[PDB]
Every structure is written in structure tokens, then in C-alpha cells.
Design a protein around this ligand. Sequence first.
Ligand SMILES: [Mg+2]
Ligand SMILES: [Mg+2]
Ligand SMILES: [Mg+2]
Lengths: 33, 101, 167, 328, 132, 113, 138
Amino acid sequence: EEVVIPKKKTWDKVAILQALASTVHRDSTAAPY
Amino acid sequence: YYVDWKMLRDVKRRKMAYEYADERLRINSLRKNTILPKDLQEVADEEIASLPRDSCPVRIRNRCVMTSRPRGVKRRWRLSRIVFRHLADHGQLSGVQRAMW
Amino acid sequence: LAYQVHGLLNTGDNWKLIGSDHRRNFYYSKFFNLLCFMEQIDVTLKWYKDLIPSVFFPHSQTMIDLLQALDVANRLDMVPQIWKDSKEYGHTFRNELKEEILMLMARDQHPPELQVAFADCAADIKSTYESQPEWPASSLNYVAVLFLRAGRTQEAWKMLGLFRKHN
Amino acid sequence: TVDFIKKQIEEFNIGKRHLANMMGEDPETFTQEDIDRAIAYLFPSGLFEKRARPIMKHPEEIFPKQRAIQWGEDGRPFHFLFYTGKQSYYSLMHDTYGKLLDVEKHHNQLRAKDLLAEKTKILKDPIGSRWLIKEELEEMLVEKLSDQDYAQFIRLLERLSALPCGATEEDFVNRFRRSIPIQSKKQLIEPLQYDEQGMAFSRGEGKRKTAKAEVVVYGQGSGRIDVNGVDYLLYFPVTQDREQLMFPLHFLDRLGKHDMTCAVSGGGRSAQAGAVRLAMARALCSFVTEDEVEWMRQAGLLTADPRVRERKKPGQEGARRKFTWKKR
Amino acid sequence: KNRAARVRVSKGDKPVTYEEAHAPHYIAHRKGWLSLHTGNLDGEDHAAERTVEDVFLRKFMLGTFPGCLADQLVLKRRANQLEICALVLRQLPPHKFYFLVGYSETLLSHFYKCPVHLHLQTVPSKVVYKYI
Amino acid sequence: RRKALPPRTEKMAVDQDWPSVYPVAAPFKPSAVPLPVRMGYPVKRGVPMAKEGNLELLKIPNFLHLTPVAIKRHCEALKDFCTEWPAALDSDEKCEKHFPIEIDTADYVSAGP
Amino acid sequence: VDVPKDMTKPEITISDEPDTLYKRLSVLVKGHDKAVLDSYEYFAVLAAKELGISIKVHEPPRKIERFTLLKSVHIFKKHRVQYEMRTLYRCLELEHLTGSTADVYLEYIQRNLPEGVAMEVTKTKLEQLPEHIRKPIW
Ligand SMILES: [Mg+2]
Ligand SMILES: [Mg+2]
Ligand SMILES: [Mg+2]
């Protein structure tokens, strides 16, 4: 009864990369990538 | 071009020995066993000695990959000591350095 | 409604929403055309450094707009900067929009602090067209007047001298 | 090269602002220490030479001191000693000799007035005072020097300080004073420890020759020693090794008064005997007086034994022993 | 004398890079490695492959960018992708530079079956550490 | 025709957020980095070499994309994917009383094709 | 000034399944130079403190492999060159983790692994008991 388990979050392959790409906006002084 | 004719002959040896590996393994299973009768292992002996001479692994030579040198080879880089030292002394081998202690 | 169109672009995918580079520079030409005259200098000078060098580079249309934006709000501080950028991006357009660039130097009144800016900006200009470039008398009105508010006669003399040597 | 330094300081301040920004710190409270941590994190160069590692520092520390312009725009040198080719050093000597002449004059006037009012300040020895090295003097004058130059100067300072000392003269020769740092070889006594209602137990750790020894001694017990859970007579069958364990106790006459437990690993039997000897000696320093600690140090009980196996070398046999050398 | 990877002292006019100014006993002390990969670490495999790759890369890059190559190549290998970092003299118009950037990246991506990154740092003339 | 453009460090704002400039793992271009940094062994009179044209700074793995501000932001964007750990399991005793079995599994990462 | 509006679109689903528990997770980074493993340990510890993963870090003893080659092309056997390979270790020991947190942290960390370092992950995962063993007897 004291035993508690959460569930698993299944995300797409590229998901974490896109979640990191969110914290970076576009650079002003930079030329095109 | 493989740097030498010797290197060529060894490439052919590694191809042939890769091809007949299964045959040799299966026959030498019979040959290396005490359990089977001798009458079987004699015929199996003629069978494995029938196989092309250049397919057996003891005729393969580890040679320097770049320079073809038949000995003085460091197995991990597959390199002659000379070529190895050349590369290492220019800083081109990561983590390799002169030893002071 | 342009703030609104820009809020629309940036939303779903900003990159997938414009097909070609020509039709891309149309966007910023017209958009910054609006931004320059319709907004306070605080906004224009701000969006300037973000859009111009980074994304897509100034045409003649976005070149004239800065010129007319600094004449109305009376900004004599940002002339050397915009000139130095327009030199980088705008080499071919130079001869035609130059006459427009320099005309904003007459409209002002020039304190003792701004002398050296005029001196440099005009000297690089005229040292560029005397080493090659039909050169307007307006530019001499400017070097001579700006050098009168500077207190420098000797160079304005050699410049009037260099125009009367231009036949 | 002045415009260079001005520029380098500008870009150092700007860059320090930038670094303060990316590292997420207050640009005002940023120190050289923090700069060092910052670049150590951003550009992590493992290299054994520390001068070959990435550095952002104030341009004055990075760049060497420059000799200033020696003349005006008319060509006339500023200093009158210029043509000597050493102006700084010979200026120094000129003023030192000027002050020695001053001391002689003043002190002679005080000889005629029946007054010796001065004292000898020449002994600073308890402060650990020494002269500058030649390097320090060389750095102070921003000029290269010679051994005979430095020796000349120092000798003249000895001439100055051997006379009656004025105030300005004392302050003068004290630029050229340095103080040698703390000299005491006195050990650091392990604070005695009281554990679980048990009283007076001390710890020590010896290391000798691949062998490590951890020794806990109780002053409340009778004489016995337990090494790795067994009796010392069992663990060290050789008499020599038991004598080695006996050395410090017999030295302090504590032979029956203490009860010890030890953990010793690696090396051979004698290496272990030695490691335990050292550990035991360092453990008995909490129970004894501050004088007998010096006595144990002077008997060589408290020093680790640096003597260690040398590496074999290629082309030789034994790291010393060489292959047989043929003449012909 | 030790001749290994040494630039001998000339009459004193000879321009020398920081790289060439340091003999083999100075690797890991002053100068670092021109290649970075896992294969030479204690428990790791396929050092041989990474080595042959390395060699071919140096030879290839030297032949593909004739005369404009300033210093020896820097090869960084991270999680199946190799970033080639190069110091390059300004010789060719940026047109040719980009042409060869793309051509090379593609060609070696298809040759070695992994993503290939190419980073060009342009320098006016060979950076001089010593003599000269 | 020879073209020399002044570096990014000129147009760089003092307070400009750093992780915007170095989002990903980068070679360290000296033009794009504002901080003067001198690495390399010095010469007897001279200093360590400048950051421009320096090959030794190119050899160095740079943590510039990982600057602590960027880690704060990244990890605050990753707070969404992580699921919580059950309370009562906090001690190993209850771990054993509930789950008796441990399965050890090794995963290796090495650079190469 | 110019701010892209509505820039975020994360995709996460919740399956009904009982996500795998990890009693302990050991991450062993092997490297050549020390400083890189230091800045990487700092980065990893910070990234673990931001996700509240509660980790310890220790340093496993370094391994130096030495070997000897001939200095000369042809013949002097009295003369040799000795070469080193130094492998240094960092061990990041994380405790009481779930499966999702494990995959996020390991993804983030593995993306940012420096070129010259390698990494070994030992996960000890918790399973209650198998079905056929629970309390049947044959
Ligand atoms: Mg041949
Ligand atoms: Mg053989
Ligand atoms: Mg011997």
C-alpha cells in the first residue's frame, strides 16, 4: 500500500533537442548560421 | 594499389581465410574430438588438408597498414613503430605522449 | 497591423512562412519602411540593429528611409554609424543615394562637439571620390559650413580648391 | 608601445564585463580569482606547464615593464646620468653615496658637540631580515644588472647601515630589506581524543616504501600491540622488526604504558615494520611533552623515509647496473 | 641528436608557428593534441581505424586546399560526428572557399558514412611564434 | 579584391545574453568571442599569443555553450520531461522490502561511425 | 527588441505503464586531460542540482599505460623512446532516480560529452519479483 509508482513519459526522439532549442532565441550580432 | 606486392598477397590470404572459416571450423571440430572414431577423423584430416593452402589462418601476417612493414608493429594501431612514432611525435595521436617518470 | 503580421510570422513556424529571398527582403524593406517614420526614434534605432545586419541587408528603399527618419526627429548623432553600415552593404547604390545622404547635413545647426564627426565622415567620402565619381557642390556646402561651425578654415580652403580643380 | 597598453586595458575591462555577464555574476564584485575560475571552466586545458594555460589578466601583469622615453623632443636626455648607459643603477648608487656622506657630516658635527644620540638598527635578525636578491633589485630599477654591480651596491648599503642611522636613512635602507617567511620546524601536535567513555587515544599514519600503516594508541592500557587483528609477535617473526616497533616506546620509556592497534598494508615485512614504526612515533606525540617531540625528531623517528625503489631504465639492466661494455 | 619533428635553428630569419617550435617531449606539457578521439583511452576500441581516417584527412585536406592551408589540422570526434577545424590563409575568393566547404563536407560524409563538419578560420598570413 | 571585416566583438552589447551566441558545441571562432584570452607559452620578453590565429585555443574543448546561465535555462526547459520519485522508497530498507531484485545493465558511448 | 511570439511547442505523452525505477545510476567518464573532466563534472553536478537528482562525485585512481619503441630506424638497441597514455576518471553516482528523469539527464549529459572523453553507464534498476516465482510452488 505504501508502494507508489509514477507513469512513464514517452516522448519523440528529437523532443529534448527541441526543448533545448526553445531556451535559445535568435542572435542579433550574428550572421546567418 | 596496396603499398607492396606482399601486402597484396596478405589481403588475398585474409579474404580466402575469411571465406573458408566455416568449413575449417566444422571439420576441425571432428578432428579435435576424442569422442568420435578414428576412421572418421582420418577422412576429416584429408578433408581439412584438401582445403586451399592459403585459407589457413597461420599464413596471415599482421603488417604495418601504411608502410607494409612485416614486424615492429604495434597491434593496437596496426602501425610500424617508425610510422607510429612519426605520427605520435607530431601530436597527431590523441592521448599519446612521451613518457617521463 | 504590421506588428500583428510579425506576431503571426514568428508564431507557428517563422521560417516556413516565407518562400524566397527576394520576397523575403520585400518584407523587411516595407516593414522597416513603416518602423522608421511611423515610430519614435527609441523604437527605430532599436529594431535597426536587430533587423539590418543580422537577417537581410538594406536596399535603396530602406536606405532613404533612415535618412528621412533622422531629418525629422533631429538626430545628428547617428549619421556616422548609419554611413559606416551603408558603406558595407550599399557599395553599388552609393552615387545615387549619396546626394540624399549629405543633404541632411545642411538642415542642422552644429555645436563644437560634433565637428570631428563631420570632418571624418566627409573626409573619407571626398578622399574616396577624388582618388577615382561626379561630385556635387552640396558636399562642399557641407564640408565648408561644418568646418565653419568647427572653426577650421584651412581645410575648407583646400576642399574648395579641390572642387575648382574638378573643372 | 603605450597605445598598445591603453588599448589592452580598454579591451580587458570590456572583456571582464562580458565574462561577468556570461558567468552570471555581478560585474563589480568580479575579482581575478573569479576570472581564473571562469576561464578554467570555459577553456579547460590540461597541460602540465601552468604558463601554457589560457589566461586573461590585466595587461600590466602580462606585459613586461617598459623603460620610459629617455629624452625630450629636442633630443636632450631627461636624467643627467643618461650617458652612463645605466642611469637607474648609477642614480641609486649616487644617492646612496650622497646619504653616506650626509651621515658622515651630521655624525661628525655630533662628534664635535659631544653627542652620540643614535643607535644600531643593523640587527633585524629576529624579523628574519635579508637583502633583496639581484632579481628583485633588477625588477625595482627596471634595468638589467651585473653580479659585481649588485655586490657593489649591497656592500655600500652595509657601509651605510654600519654607521649612526638617521630616520630618512633607516627608511632608505629599508626599501632594500625583505623579510624571510616563518622559520619554525616545530611539528603540529595532534589534539588528544576522547572516544565513547574511553579516554586518551591518539592516531598516527606512517608511510614507507609501498607500505601504509594506520596506528591508534591508547594511553590507558597495558603494553601490547595488535597488528591487523593479531599479536605483534605473530605478525613480525623477525627480531629486527619487533625491535623497530620497540624503538619509539623504548626511546620515550613508555614500554609498558600503552596499548596499540594497527592496520598495515603493502610492501614487505620490513617496510611494514618501518611504516608502523613511523605511525606509532607520530601517534605518541600527543601523549608526550613538547620537548620529547623535538627529541624524537632529532632521533629521526618522525620523518618519513624518502628512500624508494628506482625505475629500471632502457638500455641498462638495474636502473644503475649497465649492460656489459665491450672496449674492442 | 634527436631529429624527430624538429625545426632546426636557421641563421635566425626563419618564421616558425607555435606548433613547429615545440619538439615531441613538449606534447601534453606545452602544445596539445592535433586530434581528439576516445579510441586511445584505456578500455576502448578501433584506434587503428581513427588513425587511418586521420591520416587520410590530413592528406586530403592538404590536396583539396592547395597553398592556403596555414597550420596542421585539428580533428575533433564527438558521438559519430567529426568536426575538422582548419586555419586557412586568405588566397581564394570566398566563392571557391564555400564551394570546397560544401564539396568536402558532402564527399567525406558519404565516404566515411558519418556527418562531417568543416570550420574554416581565416588568417591574413602564417601566424609567427618565433624568430623572424 | 581583399575584404577584411571587423570582428563580432565590436557590435557585441555588454549585457547581451551569452547562450544566444553559443547554443551548440562550437570550434571557438575568435571573432565571435568578446573576451581577450592569451594562451600559449610566452617568449622571454614577450607575452602569450593573442586569441586570433591561435591554434592552441582551437585544440581546446570549450565549455562556452555550457555557461551556467545556459544550464539554468536548459534544465528549466527539461523540468517537463522528468517524472517524480515515490516518497516511501526514500530508505534502502523499504527498497529491499518492496523490490528484492536488482538488474545491472551497462551502456557505453564512444566517438566514431 | 525583436521578440518572436509563441515560440514553444513541446510534445509529451503519458502512458499508463509503471515507469522503471533506478536504485542507483553510475556514470563513469574516462578522459585524457584532467581540466576537461573537471569542467564536465561541474557541468554535470549543476545539471543534476537543477533537476534535483541528488548526486555524489568521486575520483577513481588514474591509469597510465607505458610502452617502449626503438629510437633508431635501423640498429641501436640500447636506445629507446617511451610513450604514455594517461586515462583519468570521474565517477558521477546518482541515487533514487526514475526512468524518465534517467533518460532526460542521460540525453542532456551525453549530448554535451567532450570529444576526447568516453562514458560508461551502469544502471541498477529495481524489479519486484518475476510472475512464476511469486508464491507458486511448481
Ligand atoms: Mg617499394
Ligand atoms: Mg604468424
Ligand atoms: Mg640488480
